[PDB]
């Protein structure tokens, strides 16, 4: 069934699973036309498909050409997401295919179930967790590859960098969700925290800076403060 | 006009014959039902006064045999049987009528209700849904599950309705996933109509039979089947014009006949609101929408 706080450690067991987040698939800028009407202009998007145990991120870049001449784009985007996840599963060897796919938004359940009818044994599940994966496009290197794409493209990343050499996947997921929640709440502040110290750099093959263990504890505290800061600014508390 | 003789009525029972019903008291001098219209299927159904649990009954067509009801004290129910000796049967019935021991099928001459509820229902198709080939009539009761229900347990006692499942490989062509799920015309017209049912008459016949089993026996799987066959049509953007007009008439008379007090348990709010107000056919069922809005506006 649904995934929530009671069965949270299930994410880090040895049954292959993927999160799918579709919040950045269909992206637009809204602008005024010469006549003073409003129109949208699509910009490139991405499907965020993540193995929470290994950190493997299958970033399917959605090029604006896939919307050309199509109607009801917000509905189509869920079906396009399901089409691409199904294609990904079919592309993997049997022993790498997921046993469960957890969608972050309930509107993806029927599109994905229908595209996955050939895989009756893969469970398609919702979640009651409010995960901050929409903020994936606040990670500079992910935003860069999406915006530069001139055609459909899949790019593979490890969203945990090398963290799993030192911490468990439970702890790595917790760090990732804290970072993404901060970036979603106040992107400028969060990026200043992450990059204010020019001596700590991002390796070419990484997404995040090369913090020591002690530095991660400081960074993590600074992100909690920021989230509490914005919460008080927001609610006047 | 045909007759169904009752050997006797040893236990108090409410007896249904089509949309009519009457009470028989324990050991009352009741010998059956006469003046049954030829040309239609019929259903004779039962609810015991001492255990309203298990409504049960028999679908039959008097053109297919001479049928009578006899209570079985071992199995504890009224059983339909066939009398093969036609002279013995005519003799028995004539005696019962002369002594006026029979209720008369009470058809008002203006009234087409039963025809309108069974227009496309044929005994031969009932006997394929309800498998018991040694009898010419078909037993149904409140508890019988459907073949689809048994997938999700005795197969001999199941209702073999045609399985409809909107999230199934049968319903969804590879590469038309979104199209076929949002517009079910392929599944309706090619898979179901051309492929399984062969024509719309057979589809409507199963739809009408499912409704009648839901209404007369409170058979839950029949209610599920009835709503699925409605929803498949309403969720198809391409439906022959004559099918939509006929569906509107079929549903109108079903809604008209439904007991007002059973609406809460025989009508699926989601399906009807979708069908009347969101679906492709939301503007095609004028008679049904009008009777629904005036009879069951709560449900909507
Ligand atoms: O009702 C009767 C009896 C007839 C003789 C007097 C007592 C009742 N039948 C007996 C079983 C039938 N057989 O065709 C038909 C029903």
From Swiss-Prot, chain A:
Effect after changing residue 23 to A: Reduced growth at 30 degrees Celsius. Strongly reduced growth at 16 degrees Celsius
Region of interest (RNase H homology domain), ranges: 7-237
Origin: domain of life: Eukaryota
Subcellular locations according to the entry: Nucleus
Other notes: Present with 468 molecules/cell in log phase SD medium.
Role: Functions as a scaffold that mediates the ordered assembly of spliceosomal proteins and snRNAs. Required for association of BRR2 with the spliceosomal U5 snRNP, and the subsequent assembly of the U4/U6-U5 tri-snRNP complex. Functions as a scaffold that positions spliceosomal U2, U5 and U6 snRNAs at splice sites on pre-mRNA substrates, so that splicing can occur. Interacts with both the 5' and the 3' splice site, as well as the branch region. Has a role in branch site-3' splice site selection. Associates with the branch site-3' splice 3'-exon region. Also has a role in cell cycle.
Domain free text: The MPN (JAB/Mov34) domain has structural similarity with deubiquitinating enzymes, but lacks the residues that would bind the catalytic metal ion. Contains a region with structural similarity to reverse transcriptase, presenting the classical thumb, fingers and palm architecture, but lacks enzyme activity, since the essential metal-binding residues are not conserved.
Subunit structure: Component of the U4/U6-U5 tri-snRNP complex composed of the U4, U6 and U5 snRNAs and at least PRP3, PRP4, PRP6, PRP8, PRP18, PRP31, PRP38, SNU13, SNU23, SNU66, SNU114, SPP381, SMB1, SMD1, SMD2, SMD3, SMX2, SMX3, LSM2, LSM3, LSM4, LSM5, LSM6, LSM7, LSM8, BRR2 and DIB1.
Name of the protein this chain belongs to: Pre-mRNA-splicing factor 8
Name of the gene: PRP8
Curated annotation (Swiss-Prot), chain B:
Name of this protein: A1 cistron-splicing factor AAR2
Other noteworthy facts: Present with 7330 molecules/cell in log phase SD medium.
Leucine-zipper: region residues: 244-265
Keyword Nucleus: yes
Organism listed in the record: Saccharomyces cerevisiae (strain ATCC 204508 / S288c) (Baker's yeast)
InterPro entries xrefs: AAR2, AAR2_C, AAR2_C_sf, Aar2_N, AAR2_N_sf
Residues bearing the modification Phosphothreonine: 257
Biological-process GO terms, alphabetical: spliceosomal snRNP assembly; spliceosomal tri-snRNP complex assembly
Oligomer and partners: Heterodimer. Interacts with PRP8 (via RNase H homology domain and MPN domain), competing with BRR2 for the same binding site. Component of a U5 snRNP complex that contains at least the U5 snRNA, PRP8, SNU114, AAR2, SMB1, SMD1, SMD2, SMD3, SME1, SMX2 and SMX3, but is not a component of the U4/U6-U5 tri-snRNP complex.
Chief site of localization: cytoplasm
A Pfam family recorded for this sequence: AAR2_1st
Function: Component of the U5 snRNP complex that is required for spliceosome assembly and for pre-mRNA splicing. Involved in splicing pre-mRNA of the A1 cistron and other genes that are important for cell growth.
Keyword terms: Cytoplasm, mRNA processing, mRNA splicing, Nucleus, Phosphoprotein
Compartments, record wording: Cytoplasm; Nucleus
Modifications after synthesis and translation: Phosphorylated on serine and tyrosine residues.
Modified residues (Phosphoserine): 236
Tree of life domain: Eukaryota
């Amino acid at each position: 069934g649904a995934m929530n706080s009671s069965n949270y450690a299930e994410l880090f067991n040895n049954d292959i699973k993927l999160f799918v987040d579709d919040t950045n698939v269909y992206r637009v800028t809204v602008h005024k036309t010469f006549e003073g009407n409003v129109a949208t202009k699509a910009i490139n998007g991405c499907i965020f498909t993540l193995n929470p145990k290994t950190g493997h991120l299958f970033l399917k870049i959605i090029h604006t050409s896939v919307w050309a001449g199509q109607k009801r784009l917000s509905q189509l985007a869920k079906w396009k997401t399901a089409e691409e996840v199904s294609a990904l599963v079919r592309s993997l060897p049997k022993e790498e295919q997921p046993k469960q796919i957890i969608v972050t938004r309930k509107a993806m359940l029927d599109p994905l179930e229908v595209h996955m009818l050939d895989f009756p044994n893969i469970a398609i599940r919702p979640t009651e967790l409010r995960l901050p994966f929409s903020a994936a496009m606040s990670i500079d290197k992910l935003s860069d590859v999406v915006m530069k794409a001139t055609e459909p493209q899949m790019v593979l990343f490890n969203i945990y960098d090398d963290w799993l050499d030192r911490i468990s996947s439970y702890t790595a997921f917790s760090r990732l969700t804290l970072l993404l929640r901060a970036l979603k709440t106040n992107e400028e502040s969060a990026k200043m925290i992450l990059l204010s110290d020019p001596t700590i750099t991002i390796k070419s093959y990484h997404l995040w800076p090369s913090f020591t263990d002690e530095q991660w504890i400081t960074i993590e505290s600074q992100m909690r403060d920021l989230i509490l800061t914005e919460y008080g600014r927001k609610y006047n508390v | 006009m045909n007759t169904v003789p009752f050997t006797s009525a040893p236990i108090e029972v409410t007896i249904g014959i089509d949309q009519y019903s009457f009470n028989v008291k324990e050991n009352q001098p009741f010998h059956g039902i006469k003046d049954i219209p030829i040309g239609h299927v019929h259903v004779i159904h039962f609810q015991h006064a001492d255990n309203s649990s298990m409504r049960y009954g028999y679908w039959f067509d008097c053109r297919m045999g001479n049928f009578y009801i006899q209570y079985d004290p071992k199995d504890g129910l009224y059983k339909m049987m066939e009398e093969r000796d036609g002279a013995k049967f005519e003799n028995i019935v004539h005696n019962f009528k002369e002594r006026q021991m029979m209720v008369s099928y009470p058809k008002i001459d203006e009234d087409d209700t039963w025809y309108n509820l069974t227009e496309f229902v044929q005994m031969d198709k009932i006997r394929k849904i309800v498998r018991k080939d040694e009898n010419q009539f078909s037993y149904v009761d409140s508890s019988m599950t459907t073949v689809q229900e048994n997938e999700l347990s005795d197969p001999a006692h199941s209702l073999n309705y045609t399985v409809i499942n909107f999230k199934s490989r049968e319903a969804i062509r590879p590469g038309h996933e979104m199209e076929d799920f949002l517009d079910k015309s392929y599944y309706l017209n090619t898979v179901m109509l051309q492929g399984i049912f062969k024509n719309s008459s057979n589809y409507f016949g199963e739809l009408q039979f499912a409704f009648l089993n839901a209404m007369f026996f409170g058979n839950y799987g029949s209610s599920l089947q009835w709503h699925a066959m409605i929803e498949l049509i309403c969720s198809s953007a391409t439906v022959p014009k004559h099918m939509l007009d006929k569906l509107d008439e079929i549903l109108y008379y079903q809604i008209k006949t439904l007991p007002e007090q059973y609406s809460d348990i025989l009508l699926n709010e989601r399906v009807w609101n979708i069908c009347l107000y969101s679906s492709f056919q939301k503007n095609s069922l004028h008679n049904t929408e009008k009777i629904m809005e005036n009879k069951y506006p709560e449900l909507l």
